[PDB]
Amino acid sequence: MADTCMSRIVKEYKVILKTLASDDPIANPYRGIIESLNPIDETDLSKWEAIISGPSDTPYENHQFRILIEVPSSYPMNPPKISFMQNNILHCNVKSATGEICLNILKPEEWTPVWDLLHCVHAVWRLLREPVCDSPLDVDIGNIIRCGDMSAYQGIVKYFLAERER
Amino acid sequence: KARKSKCIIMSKSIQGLPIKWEEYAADEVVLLVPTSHTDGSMKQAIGDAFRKTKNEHKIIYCDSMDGLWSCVRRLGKFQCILNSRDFTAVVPEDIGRFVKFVVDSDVEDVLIDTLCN
């Protein structure tokens, strides 16, 4: 360790504030992608929240999503646990009602202690551009895209997002 | 008082009903248009009435039946209204697990009655 996890996360906290404090796209490659990323309560760096914006040319365009990030006491040896809010998005790889996410770089086999929260939140964003509807957490949204029905895919997602603002 | 949430499958015969859509556009309705079985795009007046109150997002165009019935499943609205005669089993055996009340009618009084409550 709870020692080296804490120093790692405090390094990251500085890098994060410095990165996201800029509107210059070389220091900040995450402009318009990650709107904010901070720990929910500063006495507890084990819990964080993030806001991303939907990637362009997807039905997530022009909407924001809040993401919860749990850092286990064994970070960065194990990945964080990342999820959406419940009933906040509809995606092949998200179990909507729980917000659970299936993201490959978070799996034992694939995780590198080199990746950080920024890389994990970016990868979640990347997932809204590039779904993997072949092993889906949401099997009905999976079945749409696996049938190529792009009109239904864009319609249902836009329906869902518009109706969420209401 | 309380109308029930609705999933409405907009085949030709349903598009043809004399319904003042401005009146239901605000409600929790979803319109699933089967482009597979419609000869093209949905009638202008219908699109115009949802558009007028910014409920245009409640119209969803579906390039396939499988895709359409996946939408019905996921949205889970109380009622599901369709006329399976514009498609000739049509309704997947599955549908009653996600939906409370299916109306599959051929009769104008019945369809109008459940849409207008």
UniProtKB/Swiss-Prot annotation, chain A:
Function of the protein: Catalyzes the covalent attachment of ubiquitin to other proteins. Essential for peroxisome biogenesis. Required for UBC4-independent ubiquitination of PEX5.
Matches recorded under Pfam families: UQ_con
UniProt key word Nucleotide-binding: yes
Record-linked SMART domains: UBCc (SM00212)
One Gene Ontology biological process: protein autoubiquitination
SUPFAM superfamilies xref list: UBC-like
Domain (UBC core) ranges: 4-166
Molecular function (Gene Ontology), one example: ubiquitin conjugating enzyme activity
Enzyme Commission identifier(s): 2.3.2.23
Secretion signal, residue range per the UniProt entry: none
Gene behind this protein: PEX4
Catalysed reactions, as listed in the record: S-ubiquitinyl-[E1 ubiquitin-activating enzyme]-L-cysteine + [E2 ubiquitin-conjugating enzyme]-L-cysteine = [E1 ubiquitin-activating enzyme]-L-cysteine + S-ubiquitinyl-[E2 ubiquitin-conjugating enzyme]-L-cysteine
The protein, known as: Ubiquitin-conjugating enzyme E2-21 kDa
GO cellular component, one term: nucleus
UniProt KW Nucleotide-binding keyword: yes
Pathway this chain belongs to: Protein modification; protein ubiquitination
Residues the record marks as active site: 102
Protein keywords: ATP-binding, Nucleotide-binding, Peroxisome, Peroxisome biogenesis, Transferase, Ubl conjugation pathway
Family that this chain belongs to: Belongs to the ubiquitin-conjugating enzyme family.
Entry's localization field: Peroxisome
Gene3D superfamilies hit by this protein: Ubiquitin Conjugating Enzyme
Primary localisation category: other
Swiss-Prot record, chain B:
Subcellular location: Peroxisome membrane
Keyword Zinc: no
Function: Involved in peroxisome biogenesis.
GO biological process: positive regulation of protein autoubiquitination; positive regulation of protein ubiquitination; protein import into peroxisome matrix, receptor recycling
Note: Present with 259 molecules/cell in log phase SD medium.
Annotated membrane topology: Single-pass membrane protein
Tagged with keyword Transmembrane: yes
Keywords: Membrane, Peroxisome, Peroxisome biogenesis, Transmembrane, Transmembrane helix
Organism: Saccharomyces cerevisiae (strain ATCC 204508 / S288c) (Baker's yeast)
Gene Ontology CC: cytoplasm; peroxisomal membrane
Entry similarity comment: Belongs to the peroxin-22 family.
GO MF term list: ubiquitin-protein transferase activator activity
Origin superkingdom: Eukaryota
Full-sequence portion shown in this chain: 57 to 180 of 180
Protein name: Peroxisome assembly protein 22
Coiled-coil region list: none
